[PDB]
Amino acid sequence: KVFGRCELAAAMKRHGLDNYRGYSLGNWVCAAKFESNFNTQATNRNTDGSTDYGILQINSRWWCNDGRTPGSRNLCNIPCSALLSSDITASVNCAKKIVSDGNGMNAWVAWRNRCKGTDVQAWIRGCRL
Ligand SMILES: [Cl-]
Ligand code: NA
- Contact predicate 39/55, CB 8 Å: yes
Helix (H) or strand (E) holding 44: strand 43-45
Check if 7 is active-site: no
Domain spans of the chain, in order of start: 5-115
At 45 the three-state DSSP class reads strand
* Cα–Cα dist 72/40, whole Å: 23
Cβ 62 vs Cβ 72: under 8 Å: yes
As a whole number of angstroms, the distance between CA 3 and CA 38 comes to 5
HSE of 57, CA atoms in CB hemisphere, 13 A: 20
Distance 125 CA to ligand 1 centre (A): 24
- Around ion ligand 2, which residues have CB less than 5 A away? 60, 65, 69, 72, 74
Neighbours of ion ligand 1 (CB under 5 A): 104
- Measured between its terminal Cα atoms, the distance across the chain in Å is 21
Structure obtained using: X-ray
35 catalytic per annotation: yes
Q: What is the resolution of this structure in A?
A: 1.1
Architecture field, domain 5-115: Orthogonal Bundle (1.10)
Q: How far apart are CA 84 and CA 22, in angstroms?
A: 26
